[PDB]
């Protein structure tokens, strides 16, 4: 009538979202947006990245040439997927600095092996074992050459293989560790062997130790795997009076965006830049809670399953 | 069905904006949203999503640089993630505090803008409403909402009504 009322107010929602602030641990707001991806499809998208399923083989087993991993020869990938069911079925071995060799080869993204001649004079080549059978007969790592004595002598090997190409060569070699002193002398004649590989920039000297280890595939012996990189203009020098597991050639090294991941998730036909062991996830949100291990354009890993960013004023219900 | 202000009340039936007006006059009740104050808050909130990610992307590298200098063992890495996850929550918490402060701030600015318009022709009822002491029809309300209310037009009438009792 003669007067009027003019009220000021703000909007509200019947039930709002809880967020955290500097003063309140849980203050209800009219709107907020989730910043943490917490769900995955459970499958790894084969596109756009070239995914290579290891199945029963590990990257190292394929590298050395384990009989059941011969299908991965000259194989390439963007992401190598390693399964928990993978197993070794060759000569028992160990790799000092295993993580580094796995990481190094994973980064190269290829197993391109080029065979080289290597003259091994005064020794027996192509040694094998019943622990690493290939076909009906005995065998050995396809990429390694087991040298033993010829007749009654194992001479001091002194071979050189220069790198005249315009890329880095990766050579894989090893040192045999016999379980008994009779085995040592029967194979390499000398009671104590020695293997040294060097380049103009590097050098590795190792004296094998004679010791029995826990039985693996009916064997108490092992092999220690080592690796050497030879840059262009450098030379590979191998000197050995015994126990040398010679290389057959080199792997061409590349520098790229390739890597390796341990996962048991199935692979599926779909597109996702981001891959985690739990499967692919969308990369629309800035953070993620699925796995700290990731590949591709991924949100940064966070421990929280939710981080709500206030997108509205505070929500108070009307009375 | 008396109308109430923002003091301890929110308007469920207001979806066109965040702040607005609600009136009771001779021509009945009404409601309207205030777009200038609403749009001012929205412009700030648009900024915050980029800012919350432009700085979280700054700490993530900062933390890694410190741990890279130390260099990763699993107890070292999990510490890094715990420290980074704590930093992330704190940034978002700080922005949320700012969002609540700037949205509450915008409400007060609108209340004061309206008080200045009415000057001495109205009184603050205390619940976020003004009791305007003259006949203010629908056209008179829109002039307050769009910022053109001239108190001198109603000074003689308004002051005469307050004098009454």
């Amino acid at each position: 009538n003669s007067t009027a009322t003019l009220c000021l107010g703000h909007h509200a929602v019947p039930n709002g979202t809880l967020v955290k602030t500097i003063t309140d641990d849980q203050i209800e707001v009219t709107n907020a947006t989730e910043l943490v991806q917490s769900s995955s499809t459970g499958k790894i998208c084969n596109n756009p990245h070239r995914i290579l399923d290891g199945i029963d083989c590990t990257l190292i087993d394929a590298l050395l040439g384990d009989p059941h991993c011969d299908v991965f020869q000259n194989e390439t990938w963007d992401l190598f997927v390693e399964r928990s069911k993978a197993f070794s079925n060759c000569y028992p071995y160990d790799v000092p600095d295993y993580a580094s060799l796995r990481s190094l080869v994973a980064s190269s993204g290829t197993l391109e092996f080029i065979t080289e001649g290597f003259t091994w004079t005064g020794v027996t080549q192509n040694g094998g074992s019943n622990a690493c059978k290939r076909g009906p007969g005995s065998g050995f790592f396809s990429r390694l050459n087991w040298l033993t004595k010829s007749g009654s002598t194992y001479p001091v090997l002194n071979v050189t293989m220069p790198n005249n190409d315009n890329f880095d060569k990766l050579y894989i070699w090893g040192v045999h560790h016999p379980s008994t002193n009779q085995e040592q002398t029967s194979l390499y004649v000398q009671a104590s062997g020695r293997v040294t590989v060097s380049t103009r920039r590097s050098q590795q000297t190792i004296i094998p130790n004679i010791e029995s280890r826990p039985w693996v595939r009916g064997l108490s012996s092992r092999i220690s795997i080592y690796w050497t990189i030879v840059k262009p203009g450098d030379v590979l020098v191998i000197n050995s009076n015994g126990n040398l597991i010679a290389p057959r050639g080199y792997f061409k090294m590349r520098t790229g965006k390739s890597s390796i991941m341990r996962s048991d998730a199935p692979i599926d036909t779909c597109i996702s830049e981001c891959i985690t062991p739990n499967g692919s996830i969308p990369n629309d949100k800035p953070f993620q809670n699925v796995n700290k291990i990731t590949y591709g354009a991924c949100p940064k890993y966070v421990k929280q399953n939710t981080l709500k960013l206030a997108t509205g004023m505070r929500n108070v219900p009307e009375k | 069905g008396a109308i109430a202000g923002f003091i301890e009340n929110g308007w469920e039936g207001m979806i066109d904006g965040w702040y607005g007006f609600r009136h009771q006059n001779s021509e009945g009740t009404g409601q309207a949203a205030d777009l200038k104050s609403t749009q001012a808050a929205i412009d700030q909130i648009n900024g915050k999503l980029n800012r919350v990610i432009e700085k979280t992307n700054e700490k993530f590298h900062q933390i890694e640089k410190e741990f890279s200098e130390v260099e990763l063992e699993k107890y070292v890495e999990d510490t890094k993630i715990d420290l980074w996850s704590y930093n992330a929550e704190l940034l978002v918490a700080l922005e949320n505090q700012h969002t609540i402060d700037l949205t509450d701030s915008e409400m007060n600015k609108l209340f004061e803008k309206t008080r200045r318009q009415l000057r001495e022709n109205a009184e603050d009822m205390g619940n976020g409403c003004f009791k305007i002491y003259h006949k203010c029809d629908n056209a008179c309300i829109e002039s307050i909402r769009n910022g053109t209310y001239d108190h001198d037009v109603y000074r003689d009438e308004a002051l005469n009504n307050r004098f009454q009792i």
Partner: antibody
Amino acid sequence: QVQLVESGGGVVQPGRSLRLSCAASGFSFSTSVIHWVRQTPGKGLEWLAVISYDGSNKYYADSVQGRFTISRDNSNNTLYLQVNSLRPEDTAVYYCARGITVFGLLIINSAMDVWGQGTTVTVSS
Amino acid sequence: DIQMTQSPSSLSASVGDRVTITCRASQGISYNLAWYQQKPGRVPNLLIHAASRLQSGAPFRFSGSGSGTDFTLTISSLQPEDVATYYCQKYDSVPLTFGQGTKVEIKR
């Protein structure tokens, strides 16, 4: 199936008035800001007018004042553009559009999410 | 009122290229700018809104990085499907003016 189909376009002689209609189907039509946009043949889009989520508010472009009139029947899930005093600047395709929510609000000024196929209105005798 | 000045008015680029359109305003509008695509014969679909957010079911090649009175819609690794006219729209306040348009054509 979230769609909206127009109707009403056609021929009208200069000086008379038309009424286009928008028919929403498959969503909370009652809770949506709806716009109108036209295009000169092979030129560019021109934004014309907007209607609040309830009809209360209406805003029109500068070169479109006086002549046009939005309106809506929420019971009927229908929108109207009601062009009057048609001129040679009206030959064009006329589109609907839905405004997107902004931080949970049915704000009147936002971007256009869903569009109609577009009826064409050519003023000529 | 304000006045959007889209540019370039039209262009031709090759597949896999990185194209960029720029919407300019005669007065600040904040982030209240949207980008629209109109493929030949098709109705326009929304691409960017709020200057930088991307719209559901919109190809990831499209992204918007601007604010104030200077925005940029950028297509990276342009594809053949991206043949169309791109419009920017200022929705800060009425009138929700539209850009003048930008026609993107393939070079092959």
